[PDB]
Design a protein around this ligand. Structure first.
Ligand SMILES: Nc1ncnc2c1ncn2[C@@H]1O[C@H](COP(=O)(O)OP(=O)(O)OP(=O)(O)O)[C@@H](O)[C@H]1O
Lengths: 245, 59
């Protein structure tokens, strides 16, 4: 029972997901428990479980920040599992987003993060983002590094490092290619042919062991220039999740 | 003696410190050897350093 509906979270916590009481009973959880949620492609995080009666069966509440992190919109579907092994991050380094430090002065740490980390125990994972409302503005921060890795909890014993250059929001997508199947159209048979020969030997290598064959290695795509061959290969590689060179 | 890497002008300038920092050269929130890469060791005009850990011949 790990497939649930997505709903907007009225609360203003970047690491809180609400579940129905019946849903909580089915998954055998408790109020405040931290659980791991995996969305589209290979993006996943951990959120604090909350009990909310108004939530319908098989539904969950996540804010826009969580939706951006998980690459999903309202009403999408994710996979949720218990995360009882989560430890407390002993040392975390995080830096603000450049566009979020426009004109903001002073000790940004004390102003924004310290109220945000006063015994909050907010789950954190590598590459995550979280927004904090300080004063009359809002500042976003990113999980640059954590110890122990990967997913942990920020507690009082944790050492917070806010030293480093601002994180420009542009290069997260302009300089990085994170394109899934949603960015390909007009070629589905070709995508099926590529996937059934790329993902299957890698995602499920035990099948070919079971049937005692050596799956084909090479693949040669070709066509008129500008038909998206590079884009198709990039999308397949990103969806597979294997080290892409 | 101590002149084999750990003496005067090797503690004024953390030569071992430079080598170790080059080893663990990352943001990230003793022994000196030549297993790695060089790191810029800059000294002002008029200073000569002879304290590099010796190497001796092929024997
Ligand atoms: N389904 C699609 N098919 C083709 N092109 C697409 C598709 N979706 C988007 N595009 C756009 O079409 C252009 C394809 O450029 P791309 O570099 O992939 O072409 P190419 O001929 O395979 O390249 P090359 O051989 O130089 O690597 C890009 O702008 C890509 O954004």
């Amino acid at each position: 029972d790990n497939m649930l509906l997505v709903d907007d979270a009225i609360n203003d916590d970047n690491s809180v997901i609400a579940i129905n009481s019946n849903t909580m009973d089915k998954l055998e959880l408790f109020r405040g428990d931290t659980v791991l949620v995996k969305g589209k492609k290979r993006k996943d995080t951990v959120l604090i479980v909350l009990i909310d009666d108004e939530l319908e069966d098989g539904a969950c509440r996540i804010n826009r920040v969580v939706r951006n992190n998980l690459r999903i919109r309202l009403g999408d579907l994710v996979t949720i599992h218990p995360c009882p092994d989560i430890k407390y991050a002993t040392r975390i380094s995080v830096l603000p987003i450049a566009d979020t430090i426009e004109g903001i002065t002073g000790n940004l740490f004390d102003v924004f993060l310290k109220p945000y980390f006063v015994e909050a125990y907010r789950p954190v994972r590598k590459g995550d983002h979280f927004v904090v409302r300080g004063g009359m503005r809002q500042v976003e921060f990113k999980v640059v590094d954590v110890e122990p890795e990967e997913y942990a909890v920020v507690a009082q014993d944790t050492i917070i490092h806010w030293e480093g250059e601002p994180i420009n929001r542009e290069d997260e997508e302009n300089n990085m290619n994170e394109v899934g199947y949603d960015d390909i159209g007009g070629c589905r048979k070709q995508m099926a042919q590529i996937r059934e020969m790329v993902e299957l030997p890698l995602r499920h290598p035990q099948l070919f062991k079971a049937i005692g064959i050596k799956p084909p290695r090479g693949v040669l795509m070709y066509g008129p220039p500008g038909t998206g061959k590079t884009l198709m290969a990039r999308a397949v590689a990103n969806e597979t999740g294997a080290f892409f060179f | 003696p101590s002149v084999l890497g750990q003496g005067s002008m090797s503690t004024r300038i953390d030569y071992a410190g430079i080598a170790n920092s080059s080893r663990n050269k990352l943001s990230k929130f003793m022994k000196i050897t030549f297993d790695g890469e060089p790191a810029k060791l800059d000294l002002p005009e008029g200073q000569l350093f002879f304290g590099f850990p010796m190497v001796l011949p092929k024997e």
